[PDB]
Amino acid sequence: DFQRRYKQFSQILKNIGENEGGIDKFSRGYESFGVHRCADGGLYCKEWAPGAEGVFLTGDFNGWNPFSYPYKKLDYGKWELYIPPKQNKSVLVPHGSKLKVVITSKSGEILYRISPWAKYVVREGDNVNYDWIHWDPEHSYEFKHSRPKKPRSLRIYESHVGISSHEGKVASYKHFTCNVLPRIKGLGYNCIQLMAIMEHAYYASFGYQITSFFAASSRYGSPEELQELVDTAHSMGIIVLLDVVHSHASKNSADGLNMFDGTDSCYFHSGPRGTHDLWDSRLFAYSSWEVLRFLLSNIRWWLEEYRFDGFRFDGVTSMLYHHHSEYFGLQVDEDALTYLMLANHLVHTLCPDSITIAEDVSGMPALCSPISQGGGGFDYRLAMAIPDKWIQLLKEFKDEDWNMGDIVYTLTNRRYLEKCIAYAESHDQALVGDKSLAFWLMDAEMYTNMSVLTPFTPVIDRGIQLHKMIRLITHGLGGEGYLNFMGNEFGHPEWLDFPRKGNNESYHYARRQFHLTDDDLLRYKFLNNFDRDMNRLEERYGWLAAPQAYVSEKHEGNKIIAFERAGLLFIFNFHPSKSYTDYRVGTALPGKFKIVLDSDAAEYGGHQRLDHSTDFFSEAFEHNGRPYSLLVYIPSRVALILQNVD
């Protein structure tokens, strides 16, 4: 029940007001928790560690003396320490040097921890654990550019910084900034979804095993270099979203958030409930006031310090249903959902133009509706049914048996007030044990016939053609936003895989062969050219922000799908062999229609059969529930977008 959820949110928010002075003040914990050089040269420190017997600071700066700097036990399980400034006015904890919090347990155990609030952590050489590096650089980065105007419609480039080069190594923030952003802009994307930024010790977790929640991952470079990346993306008109992983945490205790104060509670729930058996991860105790301070402050942190334009919250389904659309009727974890409501509230009160996206597979209603209505407050959900339908079709059905009605139903079956992000394939489908669309479509011929020096075989023909069309149907019909994972826009060959046991720390597939699209002797350029033109076209006409399409034809015999959105006329011939010569298509208004996009074009790897100068007229002639009709010529496996120029 939604009246209850909102009464509950309102009560917790009211308390944050009466006890912490508002959610703004509340979410600024990072200003005192942690380690801070003060303006007077001393060092102020603070932790939450309710099960600790004692808390201490140690590191290079004091010769790893475990107990010479003990914190004072405060009310509510918190601890604070202030080291006086040195008489000789020199720095107490030098920039770049190592620290550790020391926790003494009820058992008399001596624990070494990285601060839950740590800015920066580095793994040195062949070491097992991460070190906590004090970060007090001489020159902080000054942001020089303002937020881009809020985009009418989101065209999202899903990105991972480490793999963004052709080299089998962890690529850098700097590399990304100089060499990848310009590419993302050139393609017509107006938003970047930045994966794997929150610190994670295990690279092959694809960024999902968080060890330090406030740390910009050190893999790629320094905190300053991330800021520059974000600042630079803004200068180019591109907005940047962060993957927020607040659904679970790595079981690491040496350099992770687990067992911080020697307990299995603290930031997490005690008992089996507080562990995620399949992910082997800890689960936050969202009911706990300090866990709300931590997570909400984390959101504020990413907003203020790195100037992100929004967030995608990963693992929302687990947050709601970990205890357990066959999801109707299940009991939701209202603690988790209240946190998400508070998060969204915070993000949108600080800036209404900020964007949040939920990764939720359950399709729970009201996740994307207003908080005042008992909803989660997300702007967007990912449309996860769509990648499934393409996989199903390609795996289980000859082309002659594809159902247009099923395709139209899956892409348009949406809740009217929920904006969602449509994409044709996920980052998960790009991984080792899986198949990409390009590979589903082309299998082994992807390694033999992607060169313009080889025959344009029927396999490669079909592959090139369907790749474009699947993307375009998804892009025009599927949602209120589009997403594309790094490389899939030009049909990147092979697969993605990270260094791990299973491959002897191989970086060989941990990269992106971006050069493939710059090679004129290869055929990737075709897929790439189409992507760029697809996005520039939407930028001009704005079909993502338009109401749902009016589907005029979902014809199973001819395999034709035709619809209107934002006034444009979309026509798909999915037939594996037949082409159509005087094919009548319904239209809303009469007049002269012209091709504005044609997948048969040569620059797209098409067959170049259409004359774009031919005028298409729709006269008053009723067809398929439309008051007007035009006649078009449309080949097998071609998509057309026609505009009314009257």
Ligand X SMILES: C[C@H]1O[C@H](O[C@H]2[C@H](O)[C@@H](O)[C@@H](O[C@H]3[C@H](O)[C@@H](O)[C@@H](O)O[C@@H]3CO)O[C@@H]2CO)[C@H](O)[C@@H](O)[C@@H]1N[C@H]1C=C(CO)[C@@H](O)[C@H](O)[C@H]1O
Question: Using CA atoms, how far apart are residues 307 and 304, in angstroms rounded to an integer?
Answer: 5
Q: Which is nearer to ligand X, 295 or 407 (CB)?
A: 295
Task: Give phi and psi for 101, each to the nearest 5.
Answer: -85, 145
Size of residue set near ligand X by CB under 6 A? 7
CB of 75 to ligand X, least distance (A): 7
**What one-character-per-residue DSSP string does 39-57 give?**
TTS-EEEEEE-TT-SEEEE
Q: Which is nearer to ligand X, 42 or 50 (CB)?
A: 50
Binding letters toward ligand X, positions 361-400, x by CB under 6 A? ----------------------------------------
Question: Using CA atoms, how far apart are residues 387 and 404, in angstroms rounded to an integer?
Answer: 16
Virtual CA dihedral for 342, 348, 351, 354, nearest 10 degrees?
120
Report if residue 136 touches ligand X, rule: CB under 6 A: no
Report if residue 416 touches ligand X, rule: CB under 6 A: no
In angstroms, how far is CA 168 from the centroid of its own chain? 23
Question: Using CA atoms, how far apart are residues 634 and 556, in angstroms rounded to an integer?
Answer: 16
DSSP 302: H
Report if residue 290 touches ligand X, rule: CB under 6 A: yes
Token pair recorded at residue 169: 């190594």
Q: Which is nearer to ligand X, 267 or 543 (CB)?
A: 267
- In DSSP terms, 216 is beta-bridged to 198
Report if residue 274 touches ligand X, rule: CB under 6 A: no
Report if residue 54 touches ligand X, rule: CB under 6 A: no
Report if residue 76 touches ligand X, rule: CB under 6 A: yes
Report if residue 12 touches ligand X, rule: CB under 6 A: no
Report if residue 335 touches ligand X, rule: CB under 6 A: no
Reference 281, options 246, 244, 308; nearest CA is 246
* List 20, 47, 314, 360, catalytic entry: 314
Reference 44, options 32, 59, 56; nearest CA is 32
- In DSSP terms, 390 is beta-bridged to none
Is residue 359 part of the annotated active site? The answer reads yes
Report if residue 19 touches ligand X, rule: CB under 6 A: yes
CB of 49 to ligand X, least distance (A): 8
Report if residue 270 touches ligand X, rule: CB under 6 A: no
Binding ligand X by CB under 6 A: which of 50, 274, 370, 567? 50
Are 371 and 381 in contact by the 8 Å Cβ rule? The answer is: no
Report if residue 77 touches ligand X, rule: CB under 6 A: yes
* List 359, 489, 538, 598, catalytic entry: 359
Binding letters toward ligand X, positions 152-171, x by CB under 6 A? --------------------
CB of 296 to ligand X, least distance (A): 13
CB of 72 to ligand X, least distance (A): 13
Other residues' Cβ atoms within 10 Å of the Cβ of residue 238 = 21
DSSP 70: B
Binding ligand X by CB under 6 A: which of 6, 141, 202, 289? 289
CB of 248 to ligand X, least distance (A): 21
Q: How many CA atoms lie within 13 A of 191 on its CB side?
A: 26
CB of 2 to ligand X, least distance (A): 27
Reference 228, options 175, 275, 278, 266; nearest CA is 175
Are 69 and 77 in contact by the 8 Å Cβ rule? The answer is: no
Report if residue 41 touches ligand X, rule: CB under 6 A: no
Q: Which residues contact ligand X (rule: CB under 6 A)?
A: 19-20, 50, 76-77, 289-290
Residues belonging to the active site: 314, 359
